[PDB]
Design a protein around this ligand. Structure first.
Ligand SMILES: N#Cc1cc2c(Oc3ccccc3OCCC(=O)N3CCCC3)cccn2c1
Lengths: 407, 544
């Protein structure tokens, strides 16, 4: 079949990212996967006149799956293949009761890739101890993880989905890289059956898929002042401090009637009853903070930023914003595993959950500010990665003195 | 040359070949050049060319003579290639073989053909005496010396040439490196020499000469600064100079050899010797060998006195790494499978004022990264820290940390938490309200406190900063209080430093504070907004 020509942004050269070292077990799994793929034509070996490179990983199930990090090639191409061949994002997917994510990446592998573009898909299987220079391939078909893949395949997709859409005009279906997000309002039992209908529709049209979110609760969580029977000076001090930090986001907080209630240099465990004029501020401020902020709108031309904080006992908090203190979403991820989980596993699930929510709500993923040493993350992140996309990220240097201010 | 298929090559997008000019050269040189270009043309490596080629490249001559072509202009125009190997294999990661042979191919780049449609851009010109007769035009047919493409193309040609032989000989291991091959096998020595002799015949059929047993080298092997021996490896002998005056250049070279030696000689230190180079600009400024540096240099000389060796890898045995603390942000580790032989050693030093547990975790990370590179796996860890110590620190630390499989080793120094702050304020303990302040211009300042029991103090300070006085305040309250104390500060800086729970710092003040924190029994530190009139705090800022 005819190939869609693919051009880079003028003046942009291809990706030249360095391949990480891998476990021997991961290397062997990759060598297997690529040996079958060369055998079916999907990839081919290349000479040294190809200088490009793109990292590769092995993840999982019990099958090893291969995972190509196409973040750099995406910036250098799809940023024009979101304009020239963009897929529009539906603002009504976040509203449905139930959303199910279905993996359809297998469809891309039939379709050939533009001849002149293949060089920029180079990747290297690494060797232990620098024994060999590396095994080098490029794609001959549309790769998973590349954002131009579902761009190119979108026409085929819109055609295969049109019969299902007519018999179900109420079911929203959005494609983001390798996945279909499908949202209904049906009862869970009906929606699930309705999901198997679309699986069988796709499967009798030649798309195999190898086989639930509720974006109703998804909001910006409210800030919680502590609820105390008696208040000490330390409690008032923690309360005054938190309330003064909130003033940067909810202007209109007042504290003068609370500062007067500690007038003399009292000891730190001294209980102090709240005056009527004091309890007026605590009540007037508990209400201006249960209502959402003003002026807080998504800007499609800016980038989303996610910040995560560790909280203790498998509890993590996050905020998604674009500008400081104008949060478009905040939440709390809690992993229940019974001390069968460590921090790095939890942070990895957290990132994946935040990224999926971000995909449903805006069709874009954020860049994460991660509370973890860089080399630690670069070493263990694939151990629990289950998604086929990879968000951009970077590593936080200084802790927050604002820890309980989100709990 | 060889029947190897050529690699196709392009000039960088939008660019034409080098059209440089050949400066006239002396007479006896113009002679000795053509004595090379007629021999090289006979062997098919070059080829006289007509006028139609408009490009050129300079050519020089230098000590029998030797030809030399400055390709630096053409290198700036040729496409880029896959980068050749950056790192080299580490001896600690070779598996012992019964026999290892070293083969070096001569004229390597000249034995490999150069893609046809690109040969024109290699044109050159031997000039006529007294610039009169037309110049002798030429061009290359093979990989020229010092061209951007030559190493990567040679590598992949060699790799392809090895293919039919490796397939008929799966029992033998070949390493490629620049222009060498290193062939190992677990064959009996008579079989091994026949395989080597048939490998050489194979490579000779493809146009690559190799040495015979008359010159095939022999253990031990001097390779990239190592000594490789039949069943052990070591670094090549190190020579630490003895000078009275030390140049900035000379300190760099010395640190180099010291880092190099640390992969197998345990316990090298380089902290003091490179603290010297902290404020470096000039390469030749002489530096005083400080007292602490001279002690470390003497202690390294002690370690280097007797040689020591590393073993090679055995995949059937476990991989163990063991870590010891050395004392001033300084750590040392050994990697081994057996109790009296190490695979290798090294050190971790933290730059940038952490604590012991945070540092230990960074050292574990470095080792884990290194293990993966060298052996493709992560070691089991033997660490000088109690589990309960470590569970305590990682559960309360703001970052996520991965703690691999590890078990405790009861060798002092141990890694411990030295103090810990309180989670809630203490009862029956005096509450100090500290504050401090300086002047950015004059560098005068004051620190003091105000307590709930009406005690008060203010101390004058010279040569200080708003940061340093805020820490000075907290030191004051720790000095003048009992074994249990509540401190209340309006400074997130000072709160940040103490809440980090360091155990050493590069500022003498913070060290004294750490001493008091050890001496005390319960210390609760607490924070309030500055200049918000909280009460307790409003009265200390006035005093200061
Ligand atoms: N000059 C040099 C040189 C030699 C080697 C080298 O030898 C090997 C080649 C093939 C398989 C295993 C090998 O090494 C096995 C470990 C072993 O018992 N020995 C004994 C002396 C040499 C190492 C491998 C890599 C780089 N090289 C650099």
């Amino acid at each position: 079949i005819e190939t869609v020509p693919v051009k880079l942004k003028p003046g942009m050269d291809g990706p030249k990212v360095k391949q990480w070292p891998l476990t021997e077990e991961k290397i062997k799994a990759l060598v297997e996967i690529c040996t079958e793929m060369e055998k079916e034509g999907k990839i081919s070996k290349i000479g040294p006149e190809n200088p490009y490179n793109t990292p590769v990983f092995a993840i999982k199930s019990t099958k090893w799956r291969k995972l190509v990090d196409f973040r750099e090639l995406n910036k250098r191409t799809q940023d024009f293949w979101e304009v020239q061949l963009g897929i529009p994002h539906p603002a009504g997917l976040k509203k449905k009761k139930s959303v199910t994510v279905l993996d359809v990446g297998d469809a891309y592998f039939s379709v050939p890739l533009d001849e002149d573009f293949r060089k920029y898909t180079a990747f290297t299987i690494p060797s232990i101890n620098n024994e060999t220079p590396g095994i080098r391939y490029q794609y001959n078909v549309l790769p998973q993880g590349w954002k131009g893949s579902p761009a190119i395949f979108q026409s085929s997709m819109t055609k295969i989905l049109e019969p299902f859409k007519k018999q179900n005009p109420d079911i929203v279906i959005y494609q983001y890289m390798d996945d279909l997000y499908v949202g209904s309002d049906l009862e869970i039992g009906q929606h699930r059956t309705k999901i198997e209908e679309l699986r069988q529709h796709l499967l009798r049209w030649g798309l195999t898929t190898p086989d639930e979110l509720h974006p109703d609760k998804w909001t910006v969580q409210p800030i919680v002042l502590p609820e105390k029977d008696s208040w000490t000076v330390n409690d008032i001090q923690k309360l005054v401090g938190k309330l003064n930090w909130a003033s940067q986001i909810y202007p209109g907080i007042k504290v003068r009637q609370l500062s007067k209630l500690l007038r003399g240099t009292k000891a730190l465990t001294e209980v102090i009853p709240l005056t009527e004029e004091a309890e007026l501020e605590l009540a007037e401020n508990r209400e201006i903070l249960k209502e959402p902020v003003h002026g807080v709108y998504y800007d499609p031309s800016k980038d989303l930023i996610a910040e995560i904080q560790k909280q203790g006992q498998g509890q993590w908090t996050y905020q998604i914003y674009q500008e400081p203190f104008k949060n478009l979403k905040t939440g709390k991820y809690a992993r229940m595993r019974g001390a069968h989980t460590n921090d790095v596993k939890q942070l990895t699930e957290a990132v994946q959950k935040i990224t999926t929510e971000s995909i449903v709500i805006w069709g874009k993923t954020p860049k994460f500010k991660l509370p973890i040493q860089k080399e630690t993350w670069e070493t263990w992140w694939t151990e629990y990665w289950q998604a086929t996309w990879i968000p951009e990220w970077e590593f936080v240097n200084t802790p927050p003195l604002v820890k309980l201010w989100y709990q | 040359i060889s029947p190897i298929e050529t690699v196709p090559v392009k000039l960088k997008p939008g660019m034409d070949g080098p059209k440089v000019k050949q400066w006239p050269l002396t007479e006896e040189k113009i002679k000795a050049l053509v004595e090379i270009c007629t021999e090289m043309e006979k062997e098919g490596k070059i080829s006289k060319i007509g006028p139609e080629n408009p490009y050129n490249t300079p050519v020089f001559a230098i000590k029998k003579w030797r030809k030399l072509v400055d390709f630096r202009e053409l290198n700036k125009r040729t496409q880029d290639f896959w980068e050749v190997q950056l790192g080299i294999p580490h001896p600690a990661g070779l598996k012992k073989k019964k026999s290892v042979t070293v083969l070096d191919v001569g004229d390597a780049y000249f034995s490999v053909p150069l893609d046809e449609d690109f040969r024109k851009y290699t044109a050159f010109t031997i000039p006529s005496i007294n610039n009169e007769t037309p110049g002798i035009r030429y061009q290359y047919n093979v990989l020229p010396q010092g061209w951007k493409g030559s190493p990567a193309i040679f590598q992949s040609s060699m790799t392809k040439i090895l293919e039919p032989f490796a397939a008929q000989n799966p029992d033998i291991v070949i390493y490629q490196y620049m222009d060498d091959l290193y062939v190992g096998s677990d064959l009996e020595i008579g079989q091994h020499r026949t395989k080597i002799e048939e490998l050489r015949q194979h490579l000779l059929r493809w146009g690559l000469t190799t040495p015979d047993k008359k010159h095939q080298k022999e253990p031990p092997f001097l390779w990239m600064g190592y000594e490789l021996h039949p069943d052990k490896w070591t670094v090549q002998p190190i020579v630490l100079p003895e000078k009275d005056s030390w140049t900035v250049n000379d300190i760099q070279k010395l640190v180099g050899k010291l880092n190099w030696a640390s992969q197998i000689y345990p316990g090298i230190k380089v902290r003091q010797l490179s603290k010297l180079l902290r404020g470096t600009k000039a390469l030749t400024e002489v530096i005083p060998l400080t007292e602490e540096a001279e002690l470390e240099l003497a202690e390294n000389r002690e370690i280097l006195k007797e040689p020591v060796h590393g073993v090679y890898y055995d995949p059937s045995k476990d991989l163990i790494a063991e870590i010891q603390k050395q004392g001033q942000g300084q750590w040392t580790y050994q990697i081994y499978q057996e109790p009296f032989k190490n695979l290798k050693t090294g050190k971790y030093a933290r730059m940038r004022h952490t604590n012991d547990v945070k540092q230990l975790t960074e050292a574990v990370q470095k080792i884990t990264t290194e293990s993966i590179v060298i052996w493709g796996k992560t070691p089991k860890f033997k660490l000088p820290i109690q589990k309960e110590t470590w569970e305590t620190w990682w559960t309360e630390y703001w970052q996520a940390t991965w703690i691999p499989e590890w078990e405790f080793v009861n060798t002092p120094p141990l890694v411990k938490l030295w103090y810990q702050l309180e989670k809630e304020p203490i009862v029956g303990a005096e509450t100090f309200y500290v504050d401090g302040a300086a002047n950015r211009e004059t560098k005068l300042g004051k620190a003091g406190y105000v307590t709930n029991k009406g005690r008060q103090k203010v101390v004058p300070l010279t040569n200080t900063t708003n940061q340093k006085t805020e820490l000075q305040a907290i030191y004051l309250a720790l000095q003048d209080s009992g074994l249990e104390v509540n401190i209340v500060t309006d400074s997130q800086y000072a709160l940040g430093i103490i809440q980090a729970q360091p155990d050493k710092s590069e500022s003498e003040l913070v060290n004294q504070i750490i001493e008091q924190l050890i001496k005390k029994e319960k210390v609760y530190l607490a924070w309030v907004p500055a200049h918000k009139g909280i009460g307790g705090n409003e009265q200390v800022d006035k005093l200061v």
